[PDB]
């Protein structure tokens, strides 16, 4: 009978819980109740890039640091470069419900996806010298809500089927697939050496994976809603998760349990984009206040405000060098501060 | 030395007058989210107007010389909660109810599925055009006596015809008290929180009906017009 | 880890009364307005009962009127359901299902048939 093995399965949770538990010498907001603080931190907004005309829902930033694609929800792609507010590339997009976008790390590939639940690959750096499909990867079973290159040929897309998906170009059949979450995947981020990735769900939980290996690894909880982002410390032993209960949250791999919880009462409405600085010191976290905010990771004291958008704060990026940090937002404007 | 960044200029010019010509031809266009169960027969409706894994489907149809851009979603997820914030800037969402779904009950599934519609947080402005589908096999279904509506919804013996109404000749008084009983039903969770910024347009539609591309036109006109007074505080 | 458990179902008469407890732990229990759902065999899921946040706002299906009753202990975080002239049409199976955000007068997919925040359910025949 399932029965017996549902109490299996509910005594090997209370064991996790009951060594996590034990493995929780202190707090550690009493190791860093006598650090120094940082102070307040203030932006302004060196650049406004225009040109969208629906909103936007993916920016992602080069290995450049020059140049970011945005994707808006009329069906367009766009290449900025945040220098000059130069637009390199305009691309239409066959699907006009596009909810994630990426950048290859050599450059030379864009990615797009969303509700057609095909993930559709552009070749910037075409012989003629235009921009076309180099392919798209049709066998999701559900929106596309994300997806990240490892390299040039291998792309892991996260759909709301439930599962991820690990896809080679060249093939262009799935090579590896990572199920087990129960809801939706939102938001998965790769590791800084892309050996490892975590994924994030709507069933309040998130998996750590193995890319190589192709299965689950570790699971975190204690989130009490649907998972909106997830971002890899700089170091990558860590990472937080930003949900829909407004408070954001930071997990240690190694640790395999929650470490600190940046919430605020005043905070209502959940997060919707998480991301770090290059240092890791300071964690950048959009809302549905319609304004961004800044944490110290230590210290968990709001340490800054971005305010100037008009509407939800959709996708935010620290660059590589951690220089600027862009918001895009859904009154289809992208904002660089510094 | 110029001459590159004259070439980037240039691009971003060309580029710029692409994007300007898209914006033409995209802010002239109405996009119209059609949503329903899959027994209530949206199949049927755009099936009928198609004369002008995928996540979701595609039909562009013409009413007087308007564009008409209507998103079926299909090969989904039962959950609709994640990709239902996409469409908060759609003109309109359709929304079909077949009428005659009772006798389990399932209609009052649709209601519900009304009311999470009516009071989400992205969809406070969003008007929805609504369907009373299935007109026909309704008339039938009361028509017999193992209907018993009552028993899904006690309020139908209280309820008396509302004086507003405008039966089509040839129709049985039972019938048409029943036909507008559903009505109201929809009317009640719309005109219940919902203060002026949306509303809903009912309609009795049925599958053999060709005036459906003229009644989408007829309450997206009215939306739109809705929308202009607010800007300029006329209503 | 989000824990919803429901009990105090079994086998009863018709005409008789339950009260069908929802204990719930993992998160604040104000925040969140909460449902119960039941599902008969033979068919899908079928929403109920609805109660808010605060409690004051209370609806419930047309085969429910005047019959069920149900009330939320945000001290004792604990949901509760009240039958009353039990028919052997509500045999079935019932699940405490909750909602994906707070601060919401009214959420999707809580019937869903994939649903995450809901109990594992009580048998209730008649």
């Known amino acids: 009978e399932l029965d017996q093995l549902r109490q299996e399965a509910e005594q090997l949770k209370n064991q996790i819980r009951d060594a996590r538990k034990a493995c929780a010498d202190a707090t550690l907001s009493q190791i860093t109740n006598n650090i120094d603080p940082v102070g307040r931190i203030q932006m302004r907004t060196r650049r406004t890039l225009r040109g969208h005309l629906a909103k936007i829902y993916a920016m992602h930033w080069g290995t450049d640091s020059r140049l970011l694609v945005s994707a808006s929800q009329d069906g367009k792609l766009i290449i900025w470069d945040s220098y000059t507010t130069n637009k390199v590339h305009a691309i239409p997009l066959r699907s006009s419900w596009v909810m994630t976008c990426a950048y290859a790390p050599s450059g030379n590939y864009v990615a797009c996806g969303g509700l057609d639940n095909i993930c559709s690959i552009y070749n910037l750096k075409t012989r003629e010298g235009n921009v076309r499909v180099s392919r798209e990867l049709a066998g999701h079973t559900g929106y596309l809500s994300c997806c990240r290159f490892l390299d040039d040929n291998q792309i892991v897309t996260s759909s709301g089927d439930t599962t991820c998906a690990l896809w080679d170009i060249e093939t262009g059949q799935q090579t590896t697939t990572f199920t087990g979450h129960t809801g939706d995947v939102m938001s998965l981020s790769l590791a800084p050496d892309t050996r490892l990735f975590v994924s994030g769900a709507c069933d309040a939980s998130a998996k750590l994976w193995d890319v190589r290996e192709g299965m689950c690894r570790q699971t975190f909880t204690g989130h009490e809603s649907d998972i909106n982002a997830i971002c890899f410390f700089p170091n990558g032993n860590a990472f937080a998760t930003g949900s829909d209960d407004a408070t954001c949250r930071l997990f240690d791999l190694r640790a395999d349990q929650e470490l600190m919880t940046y919430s605020h009462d005043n905070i209502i409405c959940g997060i919707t984009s998480v991301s770090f600085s290059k240092s890791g010191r300071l964690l950048l976290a959009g809302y549905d206040d319609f304004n961004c905010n800044v944490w110290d990771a230590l210290k968990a004291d709001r340490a800054g405000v971005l305010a100037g958008h008009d509407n939800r704060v959709s996708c935010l990026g620290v660059t590589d060098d951690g220089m600027a940090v862009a918001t895009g937002s859904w009154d289809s404007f992208l904002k660089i501060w510094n | 030395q110029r001459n590159e960044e004259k070439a980037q200029r240039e691009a971003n010019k060309k580029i710029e007058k692409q994007l300007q010509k898209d914006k033409q031809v995209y802010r002239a266009t109405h996009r119209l989210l059609l949503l329903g169960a899959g027994e209530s027969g949206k199949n049927t409706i755009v099936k009928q107007m198609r004369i002008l894994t995928s996540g979701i489907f595609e039909t562009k149809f013409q009413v007087d010389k308007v564009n008409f851009h209507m998103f079926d979603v299909g090969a989904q997820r039962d959950e609709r909660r994640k990709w239902i914030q996409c469409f908060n800037d759609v003109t309109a969402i359709i929304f079909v109810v077949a009428s005659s779904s009772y006798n389990t009950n399932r209609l009052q599934a649709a209601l519900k599925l009304f009311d999470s519609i009516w009071n989400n947080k992205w969809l406070r402005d969003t008007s929805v055009i609504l369907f009373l589908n299935k007109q026909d096999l309704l008339a039938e279904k009361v028509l017999a006596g193992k209907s018993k509506i009552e028993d899904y919804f006690p309020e139908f013996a209280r309820y008396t015809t509302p004086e507003d109404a405008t039966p089509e000749p040839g129709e049985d008084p039972r019938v048409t008290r029943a036909k507008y009983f559903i009505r109201d039903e929809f009317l009640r969770i719309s005109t219940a929180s919902g203060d002026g910024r949306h509303y809903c347009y009912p309609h009795f539609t049925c599958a053999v009906d060709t005036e459906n591309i003229r009644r989408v036109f007829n309450d997206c006109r009215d939306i739109i017009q809705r929308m202009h007074l607010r800007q300029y505080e006329l209503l | 880890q989000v824990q919803l458990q429901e009990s105090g179902g079994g086998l009863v008469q018709p005409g008789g009364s339950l009260r069908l407890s929802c204990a719930a732990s993992?998160?604040?229990?104000?925040?969140?307005?909460m449902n119960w759902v039941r599902q008969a065999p033979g068919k899908g899921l079928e929403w109920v009962s609805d109660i808010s946040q605060s409690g004051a706002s209370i609806s419930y299906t047309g085969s429910v009127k005047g019959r069920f009753t149900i009330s939320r202990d945000n001290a004792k975080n604990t949901l509760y359901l009240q039958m009353n002239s039990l028919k052997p049409e509500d045999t079935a199976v019932y699940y405490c299902?909750?909602?994906?955000?707070?601060?919401?007068?009214?959420?999707?997919?809580?019937?869903?048939?994939?649903?995450?925040?809901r109990g594992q359910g009580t048998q209730v025949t008649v």
């Open positions: 993992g998160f604040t229990f104000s925040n969140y307005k």
């Open positions: 299902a909750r909602c994906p955000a707070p601060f919401t007068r009214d959420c999707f997919d809580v019937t869903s048939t994939t649903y995450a925040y």
